[PDB]
Amino acid sequence: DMYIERAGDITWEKDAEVTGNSPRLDVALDESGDFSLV
Amino acid sequence: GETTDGVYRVMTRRLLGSTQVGVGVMQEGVFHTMWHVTKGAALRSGEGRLDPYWGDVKQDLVSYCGPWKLDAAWDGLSEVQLLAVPPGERAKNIQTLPGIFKTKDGDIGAVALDYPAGTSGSPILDKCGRVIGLYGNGVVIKNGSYVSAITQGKR
């Protein structure tokens, strides 16, 4: 059945931690909505 | 039923205890999440049953109580912020510079942020606070690390 509960306001936080790479990846989107590495 | 904008947790009281299957954006009376989270099933707002309005398995997107209303897009330049809402954890903003998912039908933004299952539907923001997509659909690289697309629907 499921339900929803609030988690907070949607807002851009001033000095948030910066993480993650910025990778360029060749991928494919099949009919089922799944991505896959080429 | 509630009208408050903001980011929401999608929990599951009956199955394996009140666990978190995903996250969602409420805006302009419409709830947005990723399809594999709800499977296009109607949801509960405590007092109001929210029914799916539009759905797309290919885009992995569904909306409730109205059409998809998020149309802000990544500028292919700026750094973004994943408003991550992990299971059993307080919401937090995570700044990053998106990578790129290269497909035959063009390129879309992708964020290299690794968060547990149940975080799907977490909004990705631009520096104006506008949701430019949802987190939770992507790939796993050789590292075992995770890269999610910045999944955005049409308005």
Three-state SS annotation for chain B: CCCCCEEEEEEECCCCCCEEEEEEEEECCEEEEEHHHHCCCCEECCCCEECEEEEECCCCEEEECCCCCCCCCCCCCCCEEEEECCCCCCCEEEEECCEEEEECCEEEEEECCCCCCCCCCEEEECCCCCEEEEECCEEECCCCCEEEECECCCC
The radius of gyration of chain A from alpha carbons, rounded to an integer in Å, stands at 17
Fold of B1-70: Thrombin, subunit H (2.40.10)
Helix (H, G, I), strand (E, B) or coil at A38: coil
Q: How far apart are CA B80 and CA B148, in angstroms?
A: 13
| Interface touch A8/B7, C-beta < 8 Å | yes
Q: How far apart are CA A5 and CA B23, in angstroms?
A: 9
- Which of B5, B95, B132 to mutate to probe the A interface, most A CBs <10 Å? B95
What is the token pair recorded at A30? 């099949």
Q: Is beta strand A3-8 parallel, antiparallel or unpaired with respect to B6-12?
A: antiparallel
Q: How far apart are CA B13 and CA B124, in angstroms?
A: 27
Distance in angstroms between the alpha carbons of the first and the last residue of chain A: 37
Distances (CA, A) of B99 to A4, B1, B107, B121, B143: 31, 38, 10, 19, 16
Please list the residues that pair with B43 across neighbouring strands: B50
What is the token pair recorded at B146? 């995770």
Judging contacts by C-beta atoms under 8 Å, the chain B residues touching residue A14 are: none
Q: How many domains does chain A have?
A: 1
CATH number of B71-155: 2.40.10.10
| Interface touch B102/A16, C-beta < 8 Å | no
Helix (H, G, I), strand (E, B) or coil at A23: coil
Closest residue, chain B, to A4 (C-alpha)? B10
Closest alpha carbon to B23 in B31, B15, A28, A11:
B31
Q: Which residues contact B106 (CB under 8 A, 6 or more apart)?
A: none
Q: Which residues contact B139 (CB under 8 A, 6 or more apart)?
A: A25, A27, A35, A36, A37, B146, B147
| Interface touch A8/B41, C-beta < 8 Å | no
Q: How far apart are CA B26 and CA B154, in angstroms?
A: 16
| Interface touch B94/A4, C-beta < 8 Å | no
The resolution in angstroms reads 1.8
Q: Is B106 exposed, middle or buried (0-12, 13-18, 19+ CB in 10 A)?
A: exposed
Q: Where are the domains of chain B?
A: 1-70, 71-155
Q: Which residues of B are catalytic?
A: 36, 60, 120
